[PDB]
Structures are given as C-alpha cells and as structure tokens.
Write a protein that holds these residues in place. Structure first.
Motif, PDB file in Angstrom:
ATOM      1  N   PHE A   1     -48.094  -9.568  44.220  1.00 51.45           N
ATOM      2  CA  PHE A   1     -47.541  -9.899  45.526  1.00 51.45           C
ATOM      3  C   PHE A   1     -48.679  -9.978  46.532  1.00 51.45           C
ATOM      4  O   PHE A   1     -49.774  -9.457  46.301  1.00 51.45           O
ATOM      5  CB  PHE A   1     -46.486  -8.878  45.970  1.00 51.45           C
ATOM      6  CG  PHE A   1     -46.909  -7.448  45.789  1.00 51.45           C
ATOM      7  CD1 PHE A   1     -47.636  -6.795  46.772  1.00 51.45           C
ATOM      8  CD2 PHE A   1     -46.573  -6.752  44.641  1.00 51.45           C
ATOM      9  CE1 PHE A   1     -48.022  -5.478  46.608  1.00 51.45           C
ATOM     10  CE2 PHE A   1     -46.957  -5.435  44.470  1.00 51.45           C
ATOM     11  CZ  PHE A   1     -47.683  -4.798  45.456  1.00 51.45           C
ATOM     12  N   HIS A   2     -48.404 -10.638  47.655  1.00 46.75           N
ATOM     13  CA  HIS A   2     -49.411 -10.875  48.685  1.00 46.75           C
ATOM     14  C   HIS A   2     -49.056 -10.107  49.951  1.00 46.75           C
ATOM     15  O   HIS A   2     -48.220 -10.567  50.743  1.00 46.75           O
ATOM     16  CB  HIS A   2     -49.529 -12.373  48.985  1.00 46.75           C
ATOM     17  CG  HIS A   2     -49.812 -13.209  47.776  1.00 46.75           C
ATOM     18  ND1 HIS A   2     -48.859 -13.477  46.816  1.00 46.75           N
ATOM     19  CD2 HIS A   2     -50.940 -13.838  47.372  1.00 46.75           C
ATOM     20  CE1 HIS A   2     -49.389 -14.234  45.873  1.00 46.75           C
ATOM     21  NE2 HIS A   2     -50.652 -14.468  46.185  1.00 46.75           N
ATOM     22  N   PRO A   3     -49.652  -8.944  50.191  1.00 50.70           N
ATOM     23  CA  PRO A   3     -49.370  -8.205  51.424  1.00 50.70           C
ATOM     24  C   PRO A   3     -50.088  -8.810  52.621  1.00 50.70           C
ATOM     25  O   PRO A   3     -51.118  -9.475  52.502  1.00 50.70           O
ATOM     26  CB  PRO A   3     -49.899  -6.800  51.121  1.00 50.70           C
ATOM     27  CG  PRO A   3     -50.999  -7.033  50.142  1.00 50.70           C
ATOM     28  CD  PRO A   3     -50.557  -8.200  49.296  1.00 50.70           C
ATOM     29  N   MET A   4     -49.515  -8.563  53.794  1.00 46.11           N
ATOM     30  CA  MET A   4     -50.049  -9.037  55.062  1.00 46.11           C
ATOM     31  C   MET A   4     -50.562  -7.846  55.872  1.00 46.11           C
ATOM     32  O   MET A   4     -50.373  -6.684  55.506  1.00 46.11           O
ATOM     33  CB  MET A   4     -48.982  -9.822  55.829  1.00 46.11           C
ATOM     34  CG  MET A   4     -49.530 -10.850  56.809  1.00 46.11           C
ATOM     35  SD  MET A   4     -50.454 -12.165  55.993  1.00 46.11           S
ATOM     36  CE  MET A   4     -49.190 -12.863  54.935  1.00 46.11           C
ATOM     37  N   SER A   5     -51.224  -8.151  56.989  1.00 44.27           N
ATOM     38  CA  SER A   5     -51.808  -7.125  57.854  1.00 44.27           C
ATOM     39  C   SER A   5     -50.707  -6.536  58.733  1.00 44.27           C
ATOM     40  O   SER A   5     -50.474  -6.953  59.869  1.00 44.27           O
ATOM     41  CB  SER A   5     -52.943  -7.708  58.688  1.00 44.27           C
ATOM     42  OG  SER A   5     -53.513  -6.722  59.531  1.00 44.27           O
ATOM     43  N   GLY A   6     -50.017  -5.539  58.182  1.00 49.06           N
ATOM     44  CA  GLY A   6     -48.967  -4.838  58.887  1.00 49.06           C
ATOM     45  C   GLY A   6     -47.560  -5.300  58.568  1.00 49.06           C
ATOM     46  O   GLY A   6     -46.601  -4.643  58.990  1.00 49.06           O
TER      47      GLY A   6
END
Lengths: 52, 51
Positions: free
Chosen positions: A32-37
């Motif tokens: 999965f691709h997490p984001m900044s916050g």
C-alpha cells in the motif's frame, strides 16, 4: 469522433510519500502507498502512516 | 411468551399484517473463504467491541 479521454487531478500540496510492503505474521503479504498524514486504508488494525 | 387463544384465528385465514420480520436483512449467494481470513476477521471484530 475519435474519443480521446483525459484524466486531470488538481493538487497544490506536494507532500512526501513512500511505498510500504507490509507482511503480516500470519502469512499475508500486501502493499500500500501511505501519504504524509493521510490514512492508508488500514488493513486489519495496522495504521502505519508516513511523516515528513 | 405464550400462545393465548384468539377468536380471529378460528377462520384459518390470517392476513399478511400478522407476520413480522425482526430486522431488515437480505441474503445472496456466497463464496467459500479460507479459515485464516475468517479467523482474522473474527479477531478484528472481537477487538472492535471490548465491552
């Protein structure tokens, strides 16, 4: 007549991000691709996020 | 709790309003899943309700 299709997505944040290849202790392995916050669609409890 | 006598039920023909379905639930064809996924879902469910 031709049918040219375009996809535009406006954005003005440009926050750093990364990829995560998580492997559960049971044996399931997904990515999965997490984001900044931003939450990354928590997969059964694990809600690991990325900071900048 | 008990089934009391009713004069309206002697005719043998009861209208549709005397049938109650507790809750709104619909069914559909399903697909078998491995035991690991079901176990993980059960664990997450029992963790979502600690009370």
């Amino acid at each position: 007549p031709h049918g040219i299709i375009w996809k535009v997505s406006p954005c003005a944040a440009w926050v750093p991000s990364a990829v995560i290849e998580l492997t559960m202790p049971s044996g399931e392995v997904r990515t999965f691709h997490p984001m900044s916050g931003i939450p990354t669609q928590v997969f059964k409890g694990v809600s690991v996020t990325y900071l900048g | 709790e008990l089934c009391s006598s009713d004069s309206g039920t002697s005719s043998g023909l009861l209208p549709s309003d005397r049938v109650l379905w507790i809750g709104d639930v619909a069914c559909q064809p399903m697909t078998p899943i491995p035991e690991e996924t079901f176990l993980e879902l059960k664990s997450f469910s029992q963790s979502e309700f600690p009370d």
